[PDB]
Each structure stands twice: as C-alpha cells, then as structure tokens.
Amino acid sequence: KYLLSPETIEALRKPTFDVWLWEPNEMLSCLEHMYHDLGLVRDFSINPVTLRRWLFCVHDNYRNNPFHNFRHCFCVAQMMYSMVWLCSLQEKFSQTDILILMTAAICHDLDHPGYNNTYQINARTELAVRYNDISPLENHHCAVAFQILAEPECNIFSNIPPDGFKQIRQGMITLILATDMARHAEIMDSFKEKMENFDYSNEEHMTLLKMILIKCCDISNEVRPMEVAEPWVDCLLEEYFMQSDREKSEGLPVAPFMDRDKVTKATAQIGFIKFVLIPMFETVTKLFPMVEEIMLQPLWESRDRYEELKRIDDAMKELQKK
Amino acid sequence: KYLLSPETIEALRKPTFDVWLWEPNEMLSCLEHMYHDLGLVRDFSINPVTLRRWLFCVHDNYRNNPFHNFRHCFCVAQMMYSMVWLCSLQEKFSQTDILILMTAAICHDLDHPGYNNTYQINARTELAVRYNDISPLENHHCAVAFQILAEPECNIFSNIPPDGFKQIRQGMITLILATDMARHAEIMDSFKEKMENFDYSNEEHMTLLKMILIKCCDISNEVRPMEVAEPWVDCLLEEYFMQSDREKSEGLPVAPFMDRDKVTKATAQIGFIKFVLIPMFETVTKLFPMVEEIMLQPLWESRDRYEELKRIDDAMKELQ
Numbered sequence: 354k355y356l357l358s359p360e361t362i363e364a365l366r367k368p369t370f371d372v373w374l375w376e377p378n379e380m381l382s383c384l385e386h387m388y389h390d391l392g393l394v395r396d397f398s399i400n401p402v403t404l405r406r407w408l409f410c411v412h413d414n415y416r417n418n419p420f421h422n423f424r425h426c427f428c429v430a431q432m433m434y435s436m437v438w439l440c441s442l443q444e445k446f447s448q449t450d451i452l453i454l455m456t457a458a459i460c461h462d463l464d465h466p467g468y469n470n471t472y473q474i475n476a477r478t479e480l481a482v483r484y485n486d487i488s489p490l491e492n493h494h495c496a497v498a499f500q501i502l503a504e505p506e507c508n509i510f511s512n513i514p515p516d517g518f519k520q521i522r523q524g525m526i527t528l529i530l531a532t533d534m535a536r537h538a539e540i541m542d543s544f545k546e547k548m549e550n551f552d553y554s555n556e557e558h559m560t561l562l563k564m565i566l567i568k569c570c571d572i573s574n575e576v577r578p579m580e581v582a583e584p585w586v587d588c589l590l591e592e593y594f595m596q597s598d599r600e601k602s603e604g605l606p607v608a609p610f611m612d613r614d615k616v617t618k619a620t621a622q623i624g625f626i627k628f629v630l631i632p633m634f635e636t637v638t639k640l641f642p643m644v645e646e647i648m649l650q651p652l653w654e655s656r657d658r659y660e661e662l663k664r665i666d667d668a669m670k671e672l673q674k675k
Numbered sequence: 676k677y678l679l680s681p682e683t684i685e686a687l688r689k690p691t692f693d694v695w696l697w698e699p700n701e702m703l704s705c706l707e708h709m710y711h712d713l714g715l716v717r718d719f720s721i722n723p724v725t726l727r728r729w730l731f732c733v734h735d736n737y738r739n740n741p742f743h744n745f746r747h748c749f750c751v752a753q754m755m756y757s758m759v760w761l762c763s764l765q766e767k768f769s770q771t772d773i774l775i776l777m778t779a780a781i782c783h784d785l786d787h788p789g790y791n792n793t794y795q796i797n798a799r800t801e802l803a804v805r806y807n808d809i810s811p812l813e814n815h816h817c818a819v820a821f822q823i824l825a826e827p828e829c830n831i832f833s834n835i836p837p838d839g840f841k842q843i844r845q846g847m848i849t850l851i852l853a854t855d856m857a858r859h860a861e862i863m864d865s866f867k868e869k870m871e872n873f874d875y876s877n878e879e880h881m882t883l884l885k886m887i888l889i890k891c892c893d894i895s896n897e898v899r900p901m902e903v904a905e906p907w908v909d910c911l912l913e914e915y916f917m918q919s920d921r922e923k924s925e926g927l928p929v930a931p932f933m934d935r936d937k938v939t940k941a942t943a944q945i946g947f948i949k950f951v952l953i954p955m956f957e958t959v960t961k962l963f964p965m966v967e968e969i970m971l972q973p974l975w976e977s978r979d980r981y982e983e984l985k986r987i988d989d990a991m992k993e994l995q
C-alpha cells in the first residue's frame with residue numbers, strides 16, 4: 354500500500370484526484386510528496402523525517418467526524434496543491450506564501466468537534482467561552498496547529514530563522530481564521546474591491562487572494578468529479594444532523610439548512626453552488642482564466658444535476674402528501 | 676469596617692475618593708454598594724447574595740501583581756462609577772449599558788500575569804499560542820470573567836433572559852477587548868470620526884463611547900488627587916521593570932519605555948499625560964463639558980508638575 358505509484362503522483366496534481374481511494378498512510382505520503390515536490394523541504398531546510406512525524410501528529414489531532422476529519426484535511430491541501438499548478442501560483446507567490454498556503458490548508462480544521470460555531474456559542478461551550486464567541490473553532494484550529502509545531506519532533510519549522518517563523522505564523526493565522534464562513538460575505542466584498550484594480554505587488558491584495566484561495570479549497574468538494582464529490586454531501590448532512598438533533602434535545606436554536614426535516618441532499622447543494630461556490634470561483638477566474646474550464650465547469654454540471662435530482666425528490670414528496 | 680458609613684458612601688461618587696485607605700473586604704463592600712445604588716440589582720433581579728459571592732470570586736481571580744491587581748480593578752470601576760454621576764450617564768444609557776460598563780470595568784484585567792502582550796507573544800507563552808497573538812491578555816481577562824459567571828453560585832445574571840445575557844456578554848467582550856493599548860489610536864480615530872457629528876441614537880456611536888469610557892477609567896490614575904495618584908506610578912514601574920528585567924534575563928526584546936535604565940518617574944508620566952490622557956479626555960469633554968473641570972484640570976496640573984520634576988532631574992544629571 355505504502356509507496357505511491359508514479360501514476361498516483363501524477364494524478365495528485367489535478368482536481369480529479371479520487372480522494373476516497375486512499376487510507377491515512379497513503380494520504381500522508383501524498384502530503385509528504387507535495388512538500389518535497391513544491392520545493393518547500395528544499396527551500397526551508399525541513400528535516401524530511403520531521404516532515405513525516407509532523408504529518409503524523411496532524412493526523413492524530415483530527416477527529417473521526419463524518420465530515421470534518423483528516424480526509425477533508427487531505428482534500429483541501431490536495432486542492433490547494435492543484436491550484437498551485439493550474440494557476441502557476443509559483444509565478445505569483447514566494448515560497449514562504451506557498452508554505453503558508455499548504456500548511457494552513459492542512460491545519461485549518463485541526464481538532465474540529467463536529468458542531469459548528471453557532472452551536473459552540475448558543476450552547477456556551479468551553480471553546481465559545483475561551484474565545485469570547487469570536488470564531489471559536491478557527492481560533493482553536495490555529496492554536497492546536499501551533500501547539501503541534503511547538504513540539505520539537507514535529508517542528509517542520511525548526512530550521513527557519515525567527516523572523517521567517519513570525520511571518521509564517523502570522524500568515525497561517527490569517528488564513529485559518531479566514532475559513533470561518535460567517536466572514537464569507539465580508540471577505541468576498543473586500544476581495545472584489547481590490548479586484549477592481551488588483552495589484553500583485555500589494556501585500557494587502559495578496560493577503561486577500563490567499564484568503565480566497567484557502568476558502569476555495571476548503572469548500573471545493575463540488576468542483577471534483579461527481580462520483581468523488583457526491584459522497585461528501587452525505588457526510589456533511591450526517592454531521593449536520595448530529596448537531597441539529599442535539600440542538601433539539603437541548604432547546605437551542607436549529608438552522609433550517611441543518612434541519613433533518615427540511616434539508617435534502619439536493620437542496621443542501623443547489624443554493625450553496627449557485628450563491629457561494631460559483632460566485633467565488635467566477636471572481637477568481639477574473640485573475641486566472643484557466644479556472645473557468647477546470648473548476649467552474651464541473652460546478653455548472655453539478656448544479657444542473659442537483660436541480661434534476663430535486664425534481665425527482667419533489668415528485669416523491671408529492672406522493673407522500675396526505 | 677465592611678459597613679460603609681454615610682460619609683464613605685458619598686465620597687465614593689467622586690474621583691477624589693482615596694482608593695488607598697480601604698482593604699479588600701471594604702472595597703468589595705463599596706463595589707457591592709455601587710450595584711444597589713445604580714439600580715442594577717433591582718432592574719436585573721440580581722440575587723443580593725449572588726452579588727457578594729461573585730465579587731469574592733472576581734477578587735480571588737486577580738493576582739498579587741504590583742500594578743495589575745485587585746485595587747487597580749477597584750480604581751477603574753470606582754472611576755466608572757464617578758463618571759456615571761458626573762456625566763449623568765443614566766440619562767444617556769440604558770440600565771443594560773450601565774451594567775455592561777460597570778461589569779466590564781470590574782472584570783477587565785482578570786488574572787493578569789504582570790507581563791504585557793508583547794512578552795506573551797515574544798516568549799511564545801501558553802496564552803499567546805492559545806490566542807494566536809491576538810490581544811492574548813484581554814481575550815483571557817474576558818474568558819475568565821465568563822468562566823466565573825458560568826458558575827451558578829457567581830452568576831449575577833442568573834435572572835436575565837437569554838437575549839439580555841447575549842446583549843450584555845457581547846457588550847462586555849467589546850469593552851474588555853478595547854482596553855488593549857495597542858488599539859488606542861485606532862479606537863481614538865473611530866471615536867473622533869463619529870464625534871464629527873455624534874448621535875446618541877446611533878448604536879455604533881454609543882458602542883465607541885462606551886469603549887472610550889472604559890478606556891478613560893482604565894488609565895485614569897493621574898486624574899485622581901496627587902496623593903492618591905502618585906503611589907500608582909511606583910506600582911506601574913515596579914511591574915514594568917519586572918518585565919524588562921525578565922526579558923533581558925531571557926534574551927527577549929526590551930521596550931525602551933519599560934526599560935529600568937532609561938525610565939524615570941517623570942518621563943513615564945509626561946508623555947502619557949500629554950499625548951494619551953489629555954487628548955482622550957478632551958474629546959469626551961465635548962460631549963460632557965463638566966469633565967473639563969473635574970478631570971482635565973487635575974491632568975494639566977499633573978502634567979505641569981511632572982514637567983517641572985523633569986527639568987529638576989535633568990539639571991541634577993547635568994550637574995554631574
């Protein structure tokens with residue numbers, strides 16, 4: 354099982370990579386390859402043995418949730434990796450920025466519990482109390498990421514000078530905190546503002562672009578081939594129901610899109626695709642045209658397919674009406 | 676002792692109150708009085724007994740630092756109390772806002788370790804790593820505040836509907852997080868921006884004002900009579916120097932303004948009074964003119980005194 358075939362290693366570079374075919378060790382090997390392949394091990398003097406141990410801690414710090422598990426972690430990092438090639442991001446970003454994008458992608462959901470921020474806050478959990486209701490999950494993911502890096506045996510940054518560490522740390526924090534969907538509209542507005550006259554030499558412009566990139570990868574499941582993308586919806590709804598169930602037997606509010614009685618696989622995706630994914634990737638296409646064909650296309654197909662599924666679903670519902 | 680006298684109860688409403696005369700149990704009694712006096716106990720159905728246990732928990736959660744200790748906590752709240760009367764804040768703010776201001780003031784520095792954010796961040800402390808370098812101390816103060824309020828025996832908000840709690844919690848977090856001096860100019864800029872045409876109806880305007888109010892009380896030591904204020908400068912430097920020593924000892928960056936070899940009592944206060952205190956109180960005076968005579972005058976006087984103490988210091992150094 355261990356040892357990636359050259360076929361796999363080449364497939365790893367595209368958004369068509371079948372993320373379900375592999376097990377922890379294989380995905381870990383793939384992640385390891387990405388760091389070597391992108392020139393990060395080289396340019397940052399990353400002890401290659403430390404790189405593997407680090408990946409092991411990361412994996413150990415992910416929970417067995419239906420959706421927010423290590424495989425999701427792998428999907429986001431693999432999609433980021435695909436973006437780097439598709440958009441030749443190495444022509445626009447320094448290696449440090451590439452390191453930040455990949456590492457934040459891998460760490461962005463560390464120790465996720467399976468219940469979102471709205472639950473944390475409403476249920477006044479320890480995390481919501483610790484972070485004063487401000488992106489409790491994302492703040493936690495960052496903290497865990499750096500508690501891991503604080504451990505010598507897992508410190509892939511041990512050979513980077515202090516100034517570079519601070520720059521990397523700051524960049525990662527910004528990107529991980531940017532994955533909080535509550536800030537989606539805000540961040541999209543900020544990006545579309547800079548978008549009027551984007552400037553690659555403008556640090557603030559690049560910061561927003563990196564935020565949009567990790568955001569894109571985080572919710573990119575529907576960009577993948579239908580057979581690869583569809584099973585994720587079930588995983589998502591499983592986790593969502595696990596929460597709405599709890600919020601119900603606790604008297605806490607319940608979100609409709611998480612309601613076991615109102616949400617279907619299709620209605621869970623149609624809106625998300627039309628008003629979240631497509632708009633975001635469209636803006637990104639204004640910067641990278643190749644994105645439209647490789648990523649906006651599968652999104653359009655997915656949207657149409659789900660709208661058809663919804664009609665069959667509505668038909669069955671009509672037959673259940675009394 | 677813990678039974679405040681009529682004289683004490685009346686003096687407690689002015690910024691001239693001598694905070695050094697009382698012991699913790701007496702200060703606790705004073706704080707307790709403030710909640711009854713302001714109508715917070717009535718209007719929020721605070722169980723009087725719970726109010727006492729809570730204050731005891733707050734007190735227990737402050738550390739014995741030379742500056743950031745329970746007495747600092749008391750000064751800020753006592754100054755906020757003074758302000759409510761001086762500016763007639765109950766005419767401008769709801770009882771919920773008064774509650775937010777008073778409770779935030781009391782909890783704003785909970786469990787402060789005696790070393791600022793720069794130290795937490797540079798030493799990569801547990802707190803800095805937990806808060807991702809974002810106002811680690813203030814975030815912590817706020818977390819402890821609600822960890823205490825989470826305990827049923829200390830929950831002074833136990834009889835407040837959920838919607839009220841949320842509005843209060845959000846308010847306190849905003850105010851406690853606003854006490855990070857790294858954000859001083861930023862907050863002053865936003866406030867002054869609103870001040871171009873202040874609107875008591877505008878919630879965003881009122882949020883900034885509350886932020887400025889708590890900020891004023893937090894660094895209001897020099898507004899107090901010279902005899903009350905003077906001792907604080909020594910507590911301030913003691914704490915500051917404890918940090919710079921440690922930083923030197925651990926090979927960490929040292930901030931000149933906290934450096935034991937460069938800071939004198941006069942240089943510590945002059946700039947602070949002239950560029951932080953006065954400008955901030957000047958803007959507030961625009962909304963509350965009575966503040967000029969009660970808080971600015973003491974400031975101008977302290978400024979002039981410390982400026983003189985400086986010329987004397989320089990002449991003494993020069994003489995050698």
Ligand SMILES: COc1ccc(NC(=O)[C@@H](C)Nc2nc(=O)c3cnn(C4CCCC4)c3[nH]2)cc1
Nearest residue numbers: 534535537571572574575589610620621622625
């Ligand atoms: C605007 O903030 C939002 C936060 C969560 C959602 N969730 C959805 O709309 C649900 C019903 N559908 C959905 N489809 C996806 O493929 C997908 C991928 N990620 N996510 C979620 C984004 C938050 C974490 C999981 C998805 N949600 C939608 C919007």
Ligand SMILES: COc1ccc(NC(=O)[C@@H](C)Nc2nc(=O)c3cnn(C4CCCC4)c3[nH]2)cc1
Nearest residue numbers: 856859893894896897911932942943944947951
């Ligand atoms: C602009 O933000 C700043 C933050 C801290 C300082 N500190 C100082 O200037 C020191 C030397 N003097 C000073 N005098 C005071 O009466 C006073 C009261 N509080 N503080 C500090 C405010 C931050 C916490 C302690 C004071 N600092 C100066 C400026």
Ligand SMILES: [Mg+2]
Nearest residue numbers: 461462490532
């Ligand atoms: Mg997340």
Ligand SMILES: [Mg+2]
Nearest residue numbers: 783784812854
């Ligand atoms: Mg403080």
Ligand SMILES: [Zn+2]
Nearest residue numbers: 425461462571
């Ligand atoms: Zn994620």
Ligand SMILES: [Zn+2]
Nearest residue numbers: 747783784893
């Ligand atoms: Zn303070």
